[PDB]
């Protein structure tokens, strides 16, 4: 393996370019770098730097596009099957695929959600990514403060690498990943330059088509991406940024169907988690009604999950080590299992 000169280091790049349909813009830059590398010596720190940067250029897909699904009902099914309700998003995404199906070529938009924490705002994202067929990627931003993380460095420093987004866009070969910025509400501020002040450059619906990261200066169109954002209260976000991105309000669940979600997904989830069986670990719907209307009143769903798994796990220990071969929860047992009522039938005066 002695091909470490210009014979193969510039060949592999120039041939790797072929199948992509590159914008004509960056081909010039790449050509000067190739010729300059040809005049450069094979060993020097300048050579390796230029070669490294050229590799970062050639890695980026240019016009490769992940094939997108277009069938509705096949998409709607899988979008629906693993969550209950949250009607707004399941309606909205469906309209989006409709518009995309109508006007041919793929398109991207930017949007956001907001509601009480733990409603499932983040679980749905991955299911969507499996519906539309875009590749998934996530990166929590909350508590970040370094703008450079999302904009790279100057490439004349020592360890400069392009900001996180380019890493995402190489890691998923398609040019149209479903990037999922997360927890925008809790970005850092007020001790260094706000990363938020950089974020605007991304999120402008039109201007982003000539994004210009500091590392690789050539503008990177990325308009087709489908951003998402998730803050649980839509006040902390600074106004100029808050205006750009349409909001969609998820809403807290009502008990009658909090039952019917927990009775379809959560209970099977917890039972599969603890490894029990419907024989070993039977539970009536009525105890779920009691538990819902007694020990847990709230918009979230984390709480009911915790109670259910607690009940099951007490039964599990009662089985594997205890005495009963089949625990059989009944309301009478409930106090033994969960503990004591917290909420009661508060009525200061019934008369």
């Amino acid at each position: 393996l002695e091909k470490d000169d210009k014979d193969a280091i510039e060949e592999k790049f120039r041939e790797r370019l072929k199948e992509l349909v590159v914008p004509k813009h960056v081909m010039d830059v790449v050509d000067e770098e190739l010729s300059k590398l040809g005049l450069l010596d094979n060993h020097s720190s300048e050579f390796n730097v230029t070669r490294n940067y050229l590799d970062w250029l050639t890695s980026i897909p240019w016009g490769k596009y992940s094939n997108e699904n277009l069938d509705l009902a096949r998409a709607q099914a899988v979008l629906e099957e693993d969550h209950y309700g949250m009607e707004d998003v399941k309606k909205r995404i469906l309209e989006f695929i409709a518009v995309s199906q109508l006007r041919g070529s793929t398109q991207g938009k930017i949007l956001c959600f907001y509601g009480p924490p733990g409603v499932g705002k983040t679980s749905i994202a991955r299911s969507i990514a499996r519906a539309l067929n875009r590749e998934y990627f996530r990166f929590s931003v909350g508590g970040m403060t370094d703008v450079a993380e999302i904009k790279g460095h100057r490439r004349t420093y020592v360890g400069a690498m392009p900001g996180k987004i380019i890493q995402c866009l190489k890691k998923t070969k398609t040019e149209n990943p479903l990037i999922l910025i997360d927890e925008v509400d809790k970005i850092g501020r007020g001790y260094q330059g706000d990363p938020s002040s950089a974020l605007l450059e991304l999120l402008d619906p039109e201007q982003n088509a000539n994004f210009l990261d500091h590392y690789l200066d050539v503008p990177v169109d990325l308009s087709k991406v489908l951003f998402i954002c998730t803050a649980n209260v839509t006040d902390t976000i600074p106004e100029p940024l808050r205006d750009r991105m349409e909001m969609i309000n998820v809403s807290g669940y009502v008990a009658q169907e909090k039952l019917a979600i927990a009775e379809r997904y959560l209970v099977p989830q917890a039972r599969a988690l603890c490894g029990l069986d419907e024989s070993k670990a039977k539970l009536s719907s009525d105890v779920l009604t009691l538990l819902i209307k007694q020990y847990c009143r709230e918009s979230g769903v984390r709480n009911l999950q915790k109670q259910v798994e607690k009940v099951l796990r007490k039964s599990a220990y009662k089985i594997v080590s205890g005495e009963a071969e089949s625990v059989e929860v009944t309301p009478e047992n409930l106090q033994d299992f969960v503990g004591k009522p917290v909420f009661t039938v508060e009525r200061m005066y019934d008369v």
């Binding site: 009502v254 008990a255 009658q256 209307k293 009525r347 008369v351």
Partner: protein
């Protein structure tokens, strides 16, 4: 509050199981209020069964799921006096 005061005046207990809410603007006009789902589910949870609401929220009361609205007789009203008739039949 006014109904509470009035009940103190006459000494008649308010009619059993009769919640009510809404704002009043100094001449018996009733006014709209937000958040109707929470009050609806709560009143349903407490077993109260004669909720009376501002007429202006009529639309919003009917946007709720039918099962949530089962079993409780709304009486929309615009001038407070009608509620005074209702609390004291």
């Amino acid at each position: 509050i006014v109904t509470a005061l009035l009940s103190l005046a006459m000494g008649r207990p308010v009619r059993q199981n009769l919640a009510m809410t809404g704002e009043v603007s100094l001449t018996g006009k009733i006014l709209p209020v937000g958040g109707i789902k929470e009050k609806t589910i709560a009143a349903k949870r407490a077993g109260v069964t004669c909720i009376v609401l501002p007429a202006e929220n009529k639309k919003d009361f009917y946007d709720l799921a039918a099962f949530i609205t089962e079993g409780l007789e709304v009486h929309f009203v615009e001038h407070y006096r009608e509620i005074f008739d209702i609390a004291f039949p």
